[PDB]
Amino acid sequence: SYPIFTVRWVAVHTLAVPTIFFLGAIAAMQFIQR
Amino acid sequence: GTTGERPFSDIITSVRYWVIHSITIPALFIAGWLFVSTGLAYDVFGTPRPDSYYAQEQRSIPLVTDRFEAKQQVETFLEQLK
Amino acid sequence: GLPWYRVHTVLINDPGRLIAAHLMHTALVAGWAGSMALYELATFDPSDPVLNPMWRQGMFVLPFMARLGVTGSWSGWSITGETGIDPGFWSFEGVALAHIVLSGLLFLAACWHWVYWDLELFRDPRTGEPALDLPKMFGIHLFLAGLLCFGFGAFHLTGLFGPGMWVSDPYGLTGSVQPVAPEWGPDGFNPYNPGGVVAHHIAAGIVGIIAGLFHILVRPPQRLYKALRMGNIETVLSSSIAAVFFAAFVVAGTMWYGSATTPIELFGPTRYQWDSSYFQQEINRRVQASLASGATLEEAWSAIPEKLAFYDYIGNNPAKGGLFRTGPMNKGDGIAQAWKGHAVFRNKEGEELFVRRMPAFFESFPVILTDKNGVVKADIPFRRAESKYSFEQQGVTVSFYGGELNGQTFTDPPTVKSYARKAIFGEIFEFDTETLNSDGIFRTSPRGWFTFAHAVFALLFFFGHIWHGARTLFRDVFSGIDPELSPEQVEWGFYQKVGDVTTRR
Amino acid sequence: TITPSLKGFFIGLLSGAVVLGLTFAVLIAISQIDKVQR
Amino acid sequence: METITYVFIFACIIALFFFAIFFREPPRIT
Amino acid sequence: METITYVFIFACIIALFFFAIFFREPPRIT
Amino acid sequence: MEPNPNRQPVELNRTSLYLGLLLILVLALLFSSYFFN
Amino acid sequence: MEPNPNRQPVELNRTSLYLGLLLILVLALLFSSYFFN
Amino acid sequence: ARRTWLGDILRPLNSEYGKVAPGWGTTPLMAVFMGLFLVCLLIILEIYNSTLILDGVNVSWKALG
Amino acid sequence: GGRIPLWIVATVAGMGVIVIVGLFFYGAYAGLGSSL
Amino acid sequence: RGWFDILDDWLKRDRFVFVGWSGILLFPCAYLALGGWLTGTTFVTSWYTHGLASSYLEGCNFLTVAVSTPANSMGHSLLLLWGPEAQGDFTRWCQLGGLWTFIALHGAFGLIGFMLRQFEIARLVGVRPYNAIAFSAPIAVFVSVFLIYPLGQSSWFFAPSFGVAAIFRFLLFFQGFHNWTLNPFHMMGVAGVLGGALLCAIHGATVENTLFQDGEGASTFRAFNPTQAEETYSMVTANRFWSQIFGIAFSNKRWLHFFMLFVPVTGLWMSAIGVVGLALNLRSYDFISQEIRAAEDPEFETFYTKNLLLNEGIRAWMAPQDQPHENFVFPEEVLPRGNAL
Amino acid sequence: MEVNQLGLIATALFVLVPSVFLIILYVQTESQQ
Amino acid sequence: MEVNQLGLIATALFVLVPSVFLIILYVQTESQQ
Ligand code: CLA
Ligand code: CLA
Ligand code: CLA
Ligand SMILES: CCCCCCCCCCCCCCCC(=O)OC[C@H](COP(=O)(O)OC[C@@H](O)CO)OC(=O)CCCCCCCCCCCCCCC
Ligand SMILES: CC1=C(/C=C/C(C)=C/C=C/C(C)=C/C=C/C=C(C)/C=C/C=C(C)/C=C/C2=C(C)CCCC2(C)C)C(C)(C)CCC1
Ligand SMILES: CC1=C(/C=C/C(C)=C/C=C/C(C)=C/C=C/C=C(C)/C=C/C=C(C)/C=C/C2=C(C)CCCC2(C)C)C(C)(C)CCC1
Ligand SMILES: CC1=C(/C=C/C(C)=C/C=C/C(C)=C/C=C/C=C(C)/C=C/C=C(C)/C=C/C2=C(C)CCCC2(C)C)C(C)(C)CCC1
Ligand SMILES: CCCCCCCCCCCCCCCCCC(=O)O
Ligand SMILES: [Fe+2]
């Protein structure tokens, strides 16, 4: 019996969600041409 | 001793976790990818595109030189790009 | 026994001997003030406030006496150069003597309190143990401080009963001690408005009186008494150190940036005036106004005060010194003797050229001359074999307007180059380098030295705040942690609340 | 006279007030909902 | 420097007078 | 004078090494 | 004159003497060049 | 290492301290003028 | 402990060691005053820093005339 | 709970990190910032 | 219970990540500083403040991205988003360098919050506050370098820009313009840092090589139990070894570990003092006696004078691009150069 | 070399004053019972 | 006045060395049982 949403959940996601977003953005940048 | 949160190994080896995240993780990754590939990042942050650092015949950098007119100076530089 | 770094902790529960030690520190500080003033008087040369002002001579305390209205000597001179002015007792010498006598009296009082430490006043009437009622002490001392602040503002600075304070024009040409009225409007919070100082001390002093009455009459809430350990004098040490390092940072900032309380005729110009060409702009404005009125170039430049020209010179920029380049600014470039005049450079075509000025960052700087549009027209080359802009090639000459060399023109390339090398420093002056055996290397001013000392001390006092505040809040574990510390108190999940055994699961 | 910079200062002060007030209100509400059992 | 040295030595001597008089080891009869 | 000062300080440090090694307070087990 | 009960003896052991002398001498060796300039 | 039995404690009482400081300071005051020359 | 005339006069001013008001007392009022003081410091800093620019307040030496 | 083995999770995640870093180096040699 | 006490309870709950009252300051500020760095390095340019590209989006790599300082014309402006410079325009704010002051300020307050966290946790668990005390060194370094130094210089522009290569440029600028290596306060800082590394290594190795045999395994880590009362390694044997190898050795564990605190902390504090000096250009740049001798005697040369020539080269060759607001134009013929290079 | 004259006394006192402080403390520790 | 430069350090050491000798002896006498 465990809760799902906790302070730890909030911390983990505040770090994780933007990280995936940024990694997608940088991956896309790899294909930009001048 | 543990503080009562569910163990991370238990969470990340569970079917439900991956049911959720096989959707969420790709969605965020694609959101970032599109943020770049649609050009919205340039607009949001004011970052020059490869063809917008200089005017065609220009070689001088558009440096901000006045504190309280800096916004207007940047806007004038952007117009001069056109 | 006590380690060497704890010897003075014997005073923590001995109020009388604490008062004695504080009296000794106060006596030493007052004695230092007197000694420093006497040394500066023995060394100071008051004969040229224009080109040899106090801030060129390494004077540290003299400007502080001058700021609050002490301006004359018993020898008959005044720092403004006036003649036949009698300051009464409160000359520089009188101030020094007063501080020395104060030092002696404080020494004697310290001896008395050290010997008669055991006074009934220092004992709690209920228990007979030494005890100080620190909250009411704070109220009393705040009331007294507020009274002194209000009196300083309402009587000394206003001139109602007192001399006033140092005030000057925006270019530091005609400073003097004047009475100042308070400025109650928004401009009173402008650091460069002296009336704001008067208004602040009046209003803050009144607030001090009121708040001191509050802190005398109203006891601390039990919550705060326990939280801040108001029974422990070390809490006062911690918070007082915090207030002091705050103040030190503030005064360092106002000294470095300039304010109504750091006049340039007392502490020297600021580095930012050089950065912004403040004085050069004023000089050019005056020259252009004269020329428009009809004067010749020689007349226009000869109308420029030597004092203004001297401000327009990088050797007076406080950001040009060195940590171990000791002594007065004079010990560097020399004792300034005269303005040589404004140097106008021209090439063979007669176009005026302008030497690029040295930024404060550079210990050395090349000599480059441009036209009014910023196009390079001449320079002093490093490699000669491919030189295109040499003074020889471009026929550079230099003509002087105003000052010693007024009306003289030079065409010999060595002489012209030497003058350009000096022109990178701004306005050109003749210096006496023999009197002090000056070595020709720039030094900072009292403004710079004060800023350095008080920034460093402020940082160190941040560490002091941390140390003594930690001691206050963790006094019960200063010698180590509980030998019986329950492992459950550090086990995870045992208590619902960290360190609260009442929350056991 | 309310200068543009004074209006901006008001904006910043009010924004900080909103941020801090929301933070503290949320913390107080959560602490009231989820109490420690003594 | 020389004036400072002379005056410093003199001031030290005067302080010594003070301590030798008022902080002497007290005579005590047997 | 400066060379003498530098060398004097260095020689003092070496003497300090000697005393700190051979005239240390001996470690003693309880 | 009753003695003051707050007095405490002070100590500096030999290792502390050696450490302090090392600190002082090394600081002097470091800063002497800048003092002579 | 048996201790050396010839060791003796050394003393200088407060009056001796004052007398010695007086001697040293007065000698310095006397000879300083000749040192500076 | 030695009694003196001045000590007798000053006695009352050092007689309430350890005395406190119950609970929170005037803490809320202290909190309000602290907030006002902080806002005032922010205003003064922004004026000195030229982030807050007010009519009639020229932050320069030219404020001397 | 432990439906998907943790060693498999770790291996797959490491492969993903390796792929991302490798793509970034490929970018070092292509497109913007390649000097070409 | 009162609402204050209930809130205290919740804040001090034992959970995976402790929050505390200090958390209310630490977590938003630390998150904003870190997130601002990542955001700027990913998407934001330095074109209008430095004439530089500084983000992944422009083509930089992890070594060359940065959140660069604002333009020199901004002076020491706080550059608030709602301030008179950006006037609430987020894009213009980013282009003007508001992210640098954003990061610096939220980071400073985050450091305050983290030190408060050290104090709060120490008080709750009943240990002494020496970790908080030691953290004062990083705070002194950060304040001196990122706030005091630029405050003494012309503007935030000359503070370090938040990036790898930008920090390297900061190092070389300090060498070229300040002769920072010659400064005895940096020298003491170097001693503190290198001596701290030496102590760390030597103590770790000494413990690991004077362990007692408390198990049969060839991997000796399992032979320690955190609740055991006995020392896990032989202080007597370690002391004998170092006495015979190096002449002196520790004999008191408490002094040993305090010394480990003292060395690096003191070194960093000394370096901070030196930087406070440099904020005013109060440098240890020259030795006047050597300069007088060299000026009069063209055959006198030392490594000191050689390094001064190197500094002159650095200044002349880097100033025009590193300080674009000065509009330096140094004709080729004025650049200092040796033979053939 | 034309060095700062006061450097000699500066260095001498910098060394001697703290060193003598330490020596005083150490000897008076040794002489204690 | 053009005095002997070494006079300052000569005088300072002449005073300090014997004085510190005496102070060491006195303090270590006081600390004895
Ligand atoms: C707030 C303090 C302060 C300030 C700002 C000044 C400022 C000034 N004084 Mg004054 N002075 C002061 C205090 C101060 N003084 C005191 C207390 C004394 C009594 C000793 C004097 C005695 C004095 C004299 C006699 C003279 C001056 C002079 C001067 C001028 C030149 C200063 C100079 O060359 O510095 C040089 C500064 C340095 C070389 C910096 C020293 C750095 C130290 C050595 C670092 C120490 C590091 C430490 C040991 C490391 C610790 C290690 C760690 C492990 C703990 C200048 C206007 C001169 C002048 O022109 O007067 C007309 C002059 O002749 N002053
Ligand atoms: C208002 C200022 C103030 C006051 C009253 C105190 C008072 C005290 N401090 Mg705190 N402290 C302060 C500022 C202050 N400190 C600051 C700014 C720092 C950071 C540098 C510290 C760091 C500090 C530590 C780390 C410790 C103390 C300790 C102590 C206690 C014993 C001090 C002692 O016996 O030293 C005896 C000192 C000597 C015998 C010689 C000191 C020689 C110094 C290093 C060089 C010479 C300085 C010079 C003569 C004076 C110039 C000062 C001027 C420039 C301001 C005492 C209660 C100690 C304590 O808590 O004990 C339980 C302790 O361990 N203090
Ligand atoms: C503890 C958290 C914390 C702290 C200490 C800071 C601190 C700071 N932030 Mg960051 N910020 C935070 C959280 C925090 N922030 C969060 C969560 C966000 C996301 C929403 C931001 C987003 C953010 C941005 C976008 C910017 C800042 C900026 C700043 C700086 C200026 C702040 C200022 O002037 O406020 C002033 C406000 C106060 C001091 C609040 C006063 C509150 C009193 C009670 C108000 C009293 C009067 C008021 C009118 C009440 C009226 C009541 C009634 C009439 C209704 C400062 C370093 C600026 C910056 O970095 O510039 C470079 C900037 O542009 N912050
Ligand atoms: C017992 C450890 C002894 C070895 C020492 C470790 C060497 C140093 C390692 C450091 C990195 C740790 C790697 C994990 C070592 C390890 O053992 O991993 C295992 C650990 C616990 O895993 P489980 O939850 O599976 O635990 C099983 C438990 O039942 C018992 O093990 O996982 C984590 O802690 C990783 C979670 C990342 C948490 C990210 C949270 C982000 C929050 C952000 C806020 C942070 C707080 C900020 C403070 C201001
Ligand atoms: C008894 C008496 C008297 C007399 C008095 C006197 C005569 C006094 C004196 C006094 C004095 C005359 C004092 C002095 C003092 C001084 C001081 C207190 C000093 C200090 C110093 C310092 C602290 C320093 C430091 C430093 C250095 C050295 C280096 C650099 C850095 C620094 C700055 C840190 C009379 C008759 C009046 C009255 C009756 C009684
Ligand atoms: C687990 C883990 C991890 C991860 C890892 C990884 C990620 C790995 C991978 C790995 C891999 C992924 C591997 C692979 C392998 C493979 C192999 C080993 C293969 C082989 C092959 C071959 C041998 C081939 C051959 C040939 C030839 C030669 C010719 C043609 C034909 C052929 C192709 C057949 C981590 C660190 C996170 C953590 C801890 C745990
Ligand atoms: C600024 C700002 C803000 C904020 C923002 C934020 C908060 C952000 C965040 C963001 C974030 C939070 C981001 C993140 C990102 C991340 C990343 C980008 C990562 C990367 C990673 C990597 C690349 C790694 C790699 C590796 C290696 C190499 C090896 C080992 C493993 C690993 C994986 C670690 C706001 C809204 C207030 C508005 C105003 C402005
Ligand atoms: C101490 C806590 C500080 C919290 C501050 C939060 C800052 C949030 C600011 C977001 C709104 C910015 C206002 C944008 C419009 C301002 C334009 C202007 O009038 O200048
Ligand atoms: Fe250890």
Distances in Å between the Cα of L23 and the Cα atoms of B57, C124, G17, K227, M32 are 77, 41, 7, 43, 16
CB contact under 8 A, I43 and D5: no
Cα(C448) to centroid(ligand 1), Å: 12
The SS3 of residue C380 is coil
Do C167 and C298 belong together in one domain? Answer: no
Q: How far is K157 from K173, CA to CA, in rounded Å?
A: 13
I46: chain D residues, CB-CB within 8 Å: 9
CB contact under 8 A, J31 and K59: yes
E21 Cβ contact partners less than 8 Å away, ≥ 6 residues apart? none
Q: Residue holding tokens 């880590």? A: K221
Domain ranges of chain D: 1-38
In a domain, C504, yes or no: no
Residues C368/C376, Cβ–Cβ less than 8 Å: yes
G9: chain C residues, CB-CB within 8 Å: 1-2
Using a 10 angstrom Cβ sphere, with 0-12 exposed, 13-18 middle and 19 or more buried, the burial of residue A2 is exposed
List the single residue in B with minimal CA-CA distance to C489. Answer: B1
CB contact under 8 A, G11 and C118: no
Q: How far is L16 from I16, CA to CA, in rounded Å?
A: 49
Q: Hey, what are C470's tokens?
A: 């930690």
Q: How far is I11 from K167, CA to CA, in rounded Å?
A: 62
List the single residue in B with minimal CA-CA distance to C497. Answer: B3
- Count of C-beta atoms within a 10 Å radius of residue K267: 23
Nearest to C162 by CA among C175, C141, C148, C174: C148
Q: Which CATH superfamily is domain B6-82 in?
A: Photosystem II cytochrome b559, alpha subunit (1.20.5.860)
For ligand 1, atom 56, the nearest C-alpha belongs to: C58
Candidate from M8, M27, M33 with C-beta closest to L33: M33
B1: chain C residues, CB-CB within 8 Å: 491-494
Q: Which chains touch G (3 or more CB pairs under 8 A)?
A: C, F, K, L
Instruction: Give the resolution to one decimal, in Å.
Output: 1.7
Domain range enclosing C4: 1-270+444-480
Do C165 and C226 belong together in one domain? Answer: yes
Do C23 and C7 belong together in one domain? Answer: yes
C11 Cβ contact partners less than 8 Å away, ≥ 6 residues apart? C17, C18, C21, G6
Backbone angles phi, psi at K195, to 5 degrees: -65, -35
L29: chain F residues, CB-CB within 8 Å: none
Q: How far is K190 from K267, CA to CA, in rounded Å?
A: 7
CB contact under 8 A, C326 and G8: no
Contact of F20 with chain K, judged by CB distance below 8 Å, is answered with: yes
Q: How far is C60 from C39, CA to CA, in rounded Å?
A: 11
Q: Which residues pair with C353 in a beta bridge?
A: C345
Distances in Å between the Cα of K157 and the Cα atoms of K98, K142, K278, K330 are 12, 16, 15, 22
Nearest to C239 by CA among C476, C464, C5, C475: C464
A8: chain K residues, CB-CB within 8 Å: 15-17
K48: chain B residues, CB-CB within 8 Å: 62-64, 74, 77
CB contact under 8 A, M4 and H17: no
Q: How far is C239 from C189, CA to CA, in rounded Å?
A: 26
CB contact under 8 A, K248 and F20: yes
Q: Within the 51-80 window of chain B, which residues sit less than 8 Å (CB to CB) from chain J? A: none
Cα(C112) to centroid(ligand 9), Å: 50
Give M31→chain H minimum CA distance, Å: 11
Method of structure determination: cryo-EM
Question: b/e string for K97-115 if b means 16 or more Cβ within 10 A?
Answer: bbbbbbbbbbbbbbbebbb
Give the mutation candidate from K284, K286, K288 for the L interface (greatest L CB count, under 10 A): K288
> Touch between chain H and chain F (3+ CB pairs, < 8 Å)?
no
- Count of C-beta atoms within a 10 Å radius of residue C281: 12
D36: chain C residues, CB-CB within 8 Å: 496-497, 503
At residue K328's C-alpha, the angle toward residues K323 and K330, to 5°, is 125
Residues K103/K40, Cβ–Cβ less than 8 Å: yes
Q: Hey, what are C425's tokens?
A: 């420093």
- Whether A13 has a binding-site annotation, put simply, is yes
Cα(H3) to centroid(ligand 3), Å: 74
Ligand 5 pocket, Cβ-based, cut-off 6 angstroms: C 28, 31-32, 35, 100-101, 103-104, 107-108
> Which CATH code of 3.40.50.150, 3.20.20.70, 6.10.250.2070, 1.10.510.10 fits the domain covering J1-36?
6.10.250.2070
Cα(K17) to centroid(ligand 4), Å: 10
Give the mutation candidate from C275, C492, C497 for the B interface (greatest B CB count, under 10 A): C492
Total count of residues recorded for chain C:
505
In a domain, C152, yes or no: yes
Candidate from L4, L25, L32 with C-beta closest to C4: L25
Contact of K132 with chain C, judged by CB distance below 8 Å, is answered with: yes
As for how many domains chain C has, the answer is 2
Q: Residue holding tokens 């932050």? A: I59
Q: How far is I24 from K4, CA to CA, in rounded Å?
A: 11
Contact of K9 with chain D, judged by CB distance below 8 Å, is answered with: yes
Q: Residue holding tokens 């000065």? A: K326
Q: For chain E, what is the radius of gyration of the CA atoms?
A: 14
Which stretches of I1-65 are DSSP H helices? 5-10, 27-49
Question: b/e string for K46-77 if b means 16 or more Cβ within 10 A?
Answer: bbbbbebbbbbbbbbeeebbbbbbbbbbbbbb
Do C276 and C220 belong together in one domain? Answer: no
Give A1→chain K minimum CA distance, Å: 16
> Touch between chain G and chain F (3+ CB pairs, < 8 Å)?
yes
Q: Which residues pair with I21 in a beta bridge?
A: C221
At residue I34's C-alpha, the angle toward residues I32 and I40, to 5°, is 105
Contact of F8 with chain G, judged by CB distance below 8 Å, is answered with: no
Cα(K82) to centroid(ligand 3), Å: 11
Contact of C7 with chain L, judged by CB distance below 8 Å, is answered with: no
Question: Strand C376-379 and strand K66-67: pairing?
Answer: unpaired
Candidate from B3, B45, B77 with C-beta closest to K91: B45
Q: Which residues pair with C176 in a beta bridge?
A: C167
Residues K114/K124, Cβ–Cβ less than 8 Å: no
Q: Hey, what are C131's tokens?
A: 């005890």
Residues C201/C152, Cβ–Cβ less than 8 Å: yes
For ligand 6, atom 6, the nearest C-alpha belongs to: J11
Give yes or no for residue C457 CB within 6 A of ligand 1.
Answer: no
In a domain, C500, yes or no: no
How far is CA L15 from its chain centroid? 4
Question: Strand C352-355 and strand C376-379: pairing?
Answer: unpaired
In a domain, C494, yes or no: no
Cα(C492) to centroid(ligand 4), Å: 14
Ligand 5, closest atom to CA C108? Answer: 40
Show the beta-strand stretches assigned E in C361-483.
368-370, 376-379, 397-401, 409-410, 428-432
Q: Which chains touch L (3 or more CB pairs under 8 A)?
A: C, F, G, K, M
Nearest to K163 by CA among K77, K28, K319, K56: K56
In a domain, C487, yes or no: no
CB contact under 8 A, B2 and C491: no
Cα(C12) to centroid(ligand 2), Å: 13
Q: Hey, what are C498's tokens?
A: 């960290």
Do C32 and C114 belong together in one domain? Answer: yes
K15: chain A residues, CB-CB within 8 Å: 6-8
